[PDB]
């Protein structure tokens, strides 16, 4: 299964793929590319094995939500993966388009550790 993460989810790339592993780690074009600008080690995800993919073109509908989010969200919604992101309003979007978008610490807690519900 993919997992496509958001650029929201940046620089908590470490955790999420040394901690959970086993999933097919997907980043978007704009999402590199924000990593660049901002200067963000996106390097740390191709080195654990996050792959790039950029669609042609899909048409994007999101009001609220910019570009580089969109198009991670998009990628997920075109695989049917699982969408990491931080953004509240991007993972409730994401959710509407039917693509399970959740939290970096909740991936974290499905990194399948089987921890005893602890307070």
Known sequence: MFAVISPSAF??????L?????????ITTLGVSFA????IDIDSAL????????????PPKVGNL???E???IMVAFELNA??????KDVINKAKELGVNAIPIEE???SSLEHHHHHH
């Not at 620089?11 to 999420?16: D, Q």
């Not at 040394?18 to 997907?26: A, L």
């Not at 654990?48 to 669609?55: E, L, S």
């Open 18 to 26: 040394g901690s959970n592993k086993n999933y097919k780690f997907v």
């Open 107 to 109: 991936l974290l807690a």
């Open 36 to 39: 660049i600008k901002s200067g």
């Open 47 to 58: 080195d654990r094995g996050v792959i790039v993919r950029a669609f042609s073109h899909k």
């Open 66 to 68: 910019p570009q580089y």
């Open 11 to 16: 620089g908590k790339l470490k955790e999420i």
């Open 82 to 87: 699982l969408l990491i992101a931080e953004d």
């Open 70 to 72: 969109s198009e991670a």
